[PDB]
Amino acid sequence: EIFSQELTQREANVKKVHENLEELQKKLDHTSFAHDRLEAQIAQKEQEQKAKLAEYDQKVQNEFDARERAEREREAARGDAAAEKQRLASLLKDLEKPMLSEEDTNILRQLFLSSAVSGSGKFSFQDLKQVLAKYADTIPEGPLKKLFVMVENDTKGRMSYITLVAVANDLAALVADFRKIDTNSNGTLSRKEFREHFVRLGFDKKSVQDALFRYADEDESDDVGFSEYVHLGLCLLVLRILYAFADFDKSGQLSKEEVQKVLEDAHIPESARKKFEHQFSVVDVDDSKSLSYQEFVMLVLLMFH
């Protein structure tokens, strides 16, 4: 709900450029074996867009800070401020797992502790990328890690563009304030609470819900704590970003062929995805030869975790 016209104009701006890039490509993507005029052009627009997005991101970030602060003011005006500072304190501590910085901890507190990004309909690639960078290492070298590295490496924009424009609203909706999920204020969500929250985000299947819960609770205690919550949430932002990274057409849903590329494109060993075809089926519950974000996320899990 960031209804600020100066942002909106930068967005429409970046989009005109990108629509160009696409055209050019498609063209050189259709000319025949005789000769690098387009490629020359294409490479151009790529830098341009890469530059427009970089400014747009910053603008989005400032807007976010403006919101968070305003949110703090509100809290205080509604109760013991000092108290509230301790709550955020106890929580951010659970993060202490990666080598987070003071800067990294604020991105995280804003994304998952605030309510500044949640729902705004905007998202910053820069904030994500910075944090992803440090969590990839926390991940055992493997398929899953190549998926993280793929979003971070952000080549030729694409990741940058999809996050800032393509699917910002949807990435903003997968994020939420732990404290708002955590009603009794125990500092650890429960299966009940977990399910409830993830039904709102679209995971209406127990089977998948359990899959997620299983993934977040590394401490094997059948309870989700801020820290594990943050780990699951950063995982969902990546898969949602890759999901859209593989939608050649605007089909809205991925195809067996489409999921194949990404996995390949991500540099994942065939030795790590041999049953891939049967799994695709198992996940296809409706058997429509095309996966949805919820299914794509059950697939990734089924396969690599």
Ligand-binding annotation for 75, yes or no, is no
Q: Residue 108 burial (CB < 10 Å; 0-12/13-18/19+)?
A: buried
Domain final position from 119, 141, 174: 174
Q: Are residues 224 and 189 in the same domain?
A: yes
Ligand-binding annotation for 247, yes or no, is yes
Q: Are residues 35 and 151 in the same domain?
A: no
Domain final position from 146, 174, 202: 174
Ligand-binding annotation for 152, yes or no, is no
Strand partners of residue 188: 225
Ligand-binding annotation for 188, yes or no, is yes
Contacts 24+ apart (CB under 8 A), 297-300: 297/203, 297/208, 297/212, 297/236, 297/239, 297/240, 298/205, 298/207, 298/208, 298/211, 299/259, 300/144, 300/147, 300/239
- In the chain the first and final C-alpha atoms are separated, in Å, by 35
Where would I find the beta strands (DSSP E) of the chain? 188-189, 224-225, 254-255, 290-291
Ligand-binding annotation for 169, yes or no, is no
Ligand-binding annotation for 127, yes or no, is no
Ligand-binding annotation for 207, yes or no, is no
Structure determination technique employed: X-ray
CATH number, domain containing residue 59: 1.20.58.90
Q: Are residues 255 and 169 in the same domain?
A: no
Q: Are residues 284 and 190 in the same domain?
A: yes
Sign of CA dihedral 60, 66, 69, 71: negative
Q: Are residues 87 and 193 in the same domain?
A: no
- CA distances 194 to 26, 209, 224, 226, 232, Å, are 44, 8, 8, 12, 11
Q: Are residues 151 and 184 in the same domain?
A: no
Ligand-binding annotation for 249, yes or no, is yes
How far is it, in rounded angstroms, from Cα 222 to Cα 43?
50
Residue 274: Cβ within 10 Å count: 11
Ligand-binding annotation for 96, yes or no, is no
Ligand-binding annotation for 170, yes or no, is no
Q: Are residues 198 and 287 in the same domain?
A: yes
How far is it, in rounded angstroms, from Cα 242 to Cα 147?
8
Ligand-binding annotation for 286, yes or no, is yes
Ligand-binding annotation for 223, yes or no, is yes
Domain holding 214, by residue range, is 175-305
Question: Of 188, 206, 187, which is closest to residue 196 (Cα–Cα)?
Answer: 206
Ligand-binding annotation for 182, yes or no, is yes
Number of domains within the chain: 3
Domain final position from 174, 200, 226: 174
CATH number, domain containing residue 86: 1.10.238.10
Ligand-binding annotation for 154, yes or no, is no
How far is it, in rounded angstroms, from Cα 194 to Cα 222?
11
Q: What string of H, E and C letters represents the secondary structure of 182-224?
A: CCCCCCEECHHHHHHHHHHCCCCCHHHHHHHHHHHCCCCCCCE
Tokens, residue 63: 């807007």
Q: Residue 193 burial (CB < 10 Å; 0-12/13-18/19+)?
A: middle
Residue 143: Cβ within 10 Å count: 17
- Cβ distance 157 to 49 under 8 Å? yes
Q: Are residues 303 and 182 in the same domain?
A: yes
The answer for residues whose C-beta is within 8 angstroms of residue 116's C-beta and 6 or more apart is 64, 65, 67, 68, 71, 110
Question: Of 175, 202, 26, which is closest to residue 107 (Cα–Cα)?
Answer: 175
- Cβ distance 238 to 103 under 8 Å? no
Dmax (CA) for the chain in angstroms is 72
